[PDB]
Amino acid sequence: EVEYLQHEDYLYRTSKLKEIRDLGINPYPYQYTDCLEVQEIRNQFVDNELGDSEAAFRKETPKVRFAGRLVLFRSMGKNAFGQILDNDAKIQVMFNRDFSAVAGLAADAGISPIKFIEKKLDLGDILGLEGYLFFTHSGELTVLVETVTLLCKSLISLPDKHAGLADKEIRYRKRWADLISSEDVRKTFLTRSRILKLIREYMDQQSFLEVETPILQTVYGGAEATPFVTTLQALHAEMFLRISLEIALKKLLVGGMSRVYEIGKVFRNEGIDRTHNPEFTMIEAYAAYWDYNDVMKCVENLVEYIVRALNNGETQVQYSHLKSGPQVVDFKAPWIRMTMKESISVYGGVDVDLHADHELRKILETQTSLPEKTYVHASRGELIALLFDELVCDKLIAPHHITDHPLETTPLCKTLRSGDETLVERFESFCLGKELCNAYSELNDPLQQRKLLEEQMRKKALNPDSEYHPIDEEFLEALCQGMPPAGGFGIGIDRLVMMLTDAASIRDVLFFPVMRR
Amino acid sequence: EVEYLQHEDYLYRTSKLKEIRDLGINPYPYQYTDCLEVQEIRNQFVDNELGDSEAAFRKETPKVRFAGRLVLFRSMGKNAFGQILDNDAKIQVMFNRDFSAVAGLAADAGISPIKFIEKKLDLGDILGLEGYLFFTHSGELTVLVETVTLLCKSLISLPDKHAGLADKEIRYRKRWADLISSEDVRKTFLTRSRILKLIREYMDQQSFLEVETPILQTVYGGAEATPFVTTLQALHAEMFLRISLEIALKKLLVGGMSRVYEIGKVFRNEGIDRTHNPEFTMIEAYAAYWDYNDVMKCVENLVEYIVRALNNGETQVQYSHLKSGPQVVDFKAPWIRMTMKESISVYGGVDVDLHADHELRKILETQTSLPEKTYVHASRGELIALLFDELVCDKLIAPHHITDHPLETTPLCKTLRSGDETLVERFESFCLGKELCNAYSELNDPLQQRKLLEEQMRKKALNPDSEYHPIDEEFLEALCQGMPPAGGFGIGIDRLVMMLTDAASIRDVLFFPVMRR
Numbered sequence A, B: 001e002v003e004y005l006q007h008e009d010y011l012y013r014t015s016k017l018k019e020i021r022d023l024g025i026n027p028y029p030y031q032y033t034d035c036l037e038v039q040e041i042r043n044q045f046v047d048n049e050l051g052d053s054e055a056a057f058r059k060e061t062p063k064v065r066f067a068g069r070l071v072l073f074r075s076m077g078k079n080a081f082g083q084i085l086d087n088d089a090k091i092q093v094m095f096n097r098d099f100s101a102v103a104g105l106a107a108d109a110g111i112s113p114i115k116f117i118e119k120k121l122d123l124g125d126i127l128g129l130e131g132y133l134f135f136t137h138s139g140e141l142t143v144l145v146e147t148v149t150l151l152c153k154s155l156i157s158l159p160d161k162h163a164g165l166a167d168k169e170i171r172y173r174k175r176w177a178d179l180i181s182s183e184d185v186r187k188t189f190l191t192r193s194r195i196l197k198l199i200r201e202y203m204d205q206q207s208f209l210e211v212e213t214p215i216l217q218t219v220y221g222g223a224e225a226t227p228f229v230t231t232l233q234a235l236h237a238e239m240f241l242r243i244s245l246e247i248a249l250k251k252l253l254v255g256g257m258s259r260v261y262e263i264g265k266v267f268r269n270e271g272i273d274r275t276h277n278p279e280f281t282m283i284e285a286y287a288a289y290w291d292y293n294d295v296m297k298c299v300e301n302l303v304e305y306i307v308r309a310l311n312n313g314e315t316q317v318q319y320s321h322l323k324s325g326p327q328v329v330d331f332k333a334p335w336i337r338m339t340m341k342e343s344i345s346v347y348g349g350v351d352v353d354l355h356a357d358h359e360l361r362k363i364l365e366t367q368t369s370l371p372e373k374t375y376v377h378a379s380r381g382e383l384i385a386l387l388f389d390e391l392v393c394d395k396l397i398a399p400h401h402i403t404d405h406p407l408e409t410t411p412l413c414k415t416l417r418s419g420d421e422t423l424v425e426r427f428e429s430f431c432l433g434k435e436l437c438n439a440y441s442e443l444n445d446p447l448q449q450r451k452l453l454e455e456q457m458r459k460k461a462l463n464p465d466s467e468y469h470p471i472d473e474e475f476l477e478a479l480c481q482g483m484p485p486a487g488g489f490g491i492g493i494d495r496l497v498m499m500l501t502d503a504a505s506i507r508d509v510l511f512f513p514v515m516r517r
């Protein structure tokens, strides 16, 4: 059952509720008006020349109102000292038997203010503090409390501040306990919100318009993933949650919007690990009249701009959690640019074009651990893509753009303008061994687009494991209306946040990651 | 069965693909570099001192590059005039037999550049235009085209002008067609993106931090609605799509984040009509130490800010689509504020506290069309909400805050600080007869919170249509940890957009609304 309900701390704390109410005090009052943030008080008076505690007892120093969680308390007889935590900022408080009052505690109440503070309040309680600032002689900003208001009676103790492994697992669900206890977790999620704001700022200054498109669709596409399925009762209809943003934003290009982007949740019904949460956040952005080379500059300039805003103009970032040891990656533009075939020579030590189809298969079995079935009857392009996965991807620690993928890797990209129809003008961006961005010179030839989707459906998806998706005819009709030439990209925002906050796992950049029962 | 694949105009348009490629012209080229938006060109030269067509023929006026869809065209022998549509801006083009070249059309080809324009291009094609600006004699801004570039060969015609119900109904699905043909549709959606940006700007200015919380959860709550259900394969687990944002954000307040908001998709497996799409966008925002009066000011100030920013500082807006005829509504703060009982007197003609329960029932019986099951055994508070629904809600045309609802309307709100425990510190905002906002002095007494959820569970146990809905124990434990007093609101953004863009239906403010088969 619910275990804390029989814990001593809960039973003891709850028995104070009737005692506090019997004193005429509401332990869950309605507001605390006109109260500054602790951080704003610090900013306002940290270099100020405030008096000492005696100036505060004489009420000569500035008077403040603020609120927060009691996280430290020590009674010293006539005086008590404490620490209030407010929205990632801390400040010391001092209570005095003669100077401090408790809001709502009558003079003819049977308990003194200082004793109420010691006996009826607890660590974890949320308090409103009104009082006078001073500096200790060590320079610690402190508030001499004139009136303390109980704002919330907490019924369990503060979480353990320093979590072991088992507690850390629980706190991926009980995330509030992490946020109370850990400055580092608080900073991570503050940086995440800042990153999302920097993305919108950059896109807006490039004249992209932000839109929303449906998560629930009768189709799915724009990526290779098992979808989530659900039922819409009004129409008695099966619906898919989107696996990507691509098809919807391309229809808006046909609709005439030259630069669109969307930052949204997508859903891939796949595995859970350090880099995969089934619900994650993507940006996709499309710019008419661009190709993948324009997109490549846009993507690296976006990331460089975010890194500079977060790191005082510096472009270098430390990441600590690779198995190879702590690294420094420089996000300065331009990033390393290589074709896939080139990356296999440089990092895999294999010049792909000097080997025959059957010869490439022998390299796989000998130099990799892939199952024989993966490469036994794979086409040449698929064989190159597999050699990249196993011999190159993990060596891509510094930011890389990998260009010119085999046609097999996607049906939505134009082929190389040189006339080489076995490769597409695609790039994928990699950093710290993980994929960060996917981008195309977008396909807008409607007849070629149909042929590629038909050959992906029939020819490729006759594998017993693949879930049949029918050809998206509304998308082909939109292309017939006419989509401009365009360049588009998608970025896994959660993975970007990981690289910029030194997070070992995607679970560390999501408030509430998917968790087992 | 796709119809257009058998229509004459698709044969006529596709036939030109070979002819265009035989002339060495790629009809789906890769880019159009250094390409200004038509809107940018108008802003720089509409108020300029441009010359006439003869100055342009002398290549003395400003030279520009832009692109867009050919939406009008008329040949006059040596000269031809057309209209280019680019992201809701239009500009006239002039072609001339001797001045205009076609990109990639060799001199030794079998057709003249001007005849190529007439015979190989069509209304609907996307073109790149390079030429010289000038003013027609009537003052219309125009470009004398030096080089036209085919950027996309459209295979179907421009959408038709005459639309019945079925032709506009199809456009709710084929939205790209709607965007190309209707200036009002384009402006509605441009305005929508502006509104979202203004909401963020206002919330950030109030020091609210924007966060993301999960759509897929093991529970659902924070509103009354049937959820969507899906399956997460990796854990063999049933999941719910969220019906609101509330529980997750409250946990972040427990975590110590003073002010948070989220703008995100929620999903209610309910009916489809003018004000209901099963997937819709909400903002929810929570501020520690506020109550519902603080929230009320924040809500009306937020909307007034948006309205002034869109309407050159004006606060009045026209709305055309109510059955009572066109209204003007004024979003000027403060909005009209009324308790629910007051509104029932003012607008319903019933003074509820002068009546016994059975007289309230008799009123519902004779003055409304409710089925007898709805009220014959309803509690007094339930009867009051039904009197509001049936006699008041439709009449709230001007913006209203309706306050102090019966306790039965929600389990997540504090009762009146006056001590009247039959009513809660809730308000709902109404405009144009529709609910816009729901807001609370948030309940943070853990024992009271369990008690209200248990009472709701007891009441639902008597309705055979609702399945057992377990209490969210993690939420209760977070409240035991301690949530500050707080004020929170949720706004249906799609309904807000409807009111500020004179949209008859929620389907007019969603790019792709839910549609029957």
Ligand SMILES: C[C@H]1CCC[C@H](C[C@H]2Cc3cc(O)cc(O)c3C(=O)O2)O1
Residues within 6 Å of the ligand: A268, A269, A270, A271, A275, A276, A277, A278, A279, A280, A282, A435, A436, A437, A438, A490, A491, A492, A493, A494, A495, A506
């Ligand atoms: C945004 C696009 C292109 C760039 C790589 C990125 C990888 C994407 C894969 C992916 C799959 C999945 O099931 C769960 C996830 O959390 C991710 C992810 O974070 O990153 O996808």
Ligand SMILES: C[C@H]1CCC[C@H](C[C@H]2Cc3cc(O)cc(O)c3C(=O)O2)O1
Residues within 6 Å of the ligand: B268, B269, B270, B271, B275, B276, B277, B278, B279, B280, B282, B435, B436, B437, B438, B490, B491, B492, B493, B494, B495, B506
């Ligand atoms: C945002 C919260 C509080 C304010 C009213 C608002 C109404 C909400 C109801 C609702 C239910 C539904 O199934 C589909 C919908 O599109 C809406 C909606 O737009 O607005 O809900």
Ligand SMILES: N[C@@H](CCCC[NH3+])C(=O)O
Residues within 6 Å of the ligand: A222, A223, A243, A244, A245, A246, A284, A438, A439, A440, A442, A488, A489, A490, A491
């Ligand atoms: N839909 C792609 C992102 C955009 C790729 C370029 N059009 C993905 O999920 O990877």
Ligand SMILES: N[C@@H](CCCC[NH3+])C(=O)O
Residues within 6 Å of the ligand: B222, B223, B243, B244, B245, B246, B284, B412, B438, B439, B440, B442, B488, B489, B490, B491
């Ligand atoms: N969760 C509410 C909105 C917030 C109400 C105030 N806590 C709803 O869906 O109506």
Ligand SMILES: [Cl-]
Residues within 6 Å of the ligand: A164, A165, A166
């Ligand atoms: Cl441990």
Ligand code: NA
Residues within 6 Å of the ligand: B365, B366, B368, B369, B370
């Ligand atoms: Na009746």
Ligand code: NA
Residues within 6 Å of the ligand: B460, B461, B462, B463, B464, B465, B466, B467, B468
């Ligand atoms: Na039931």
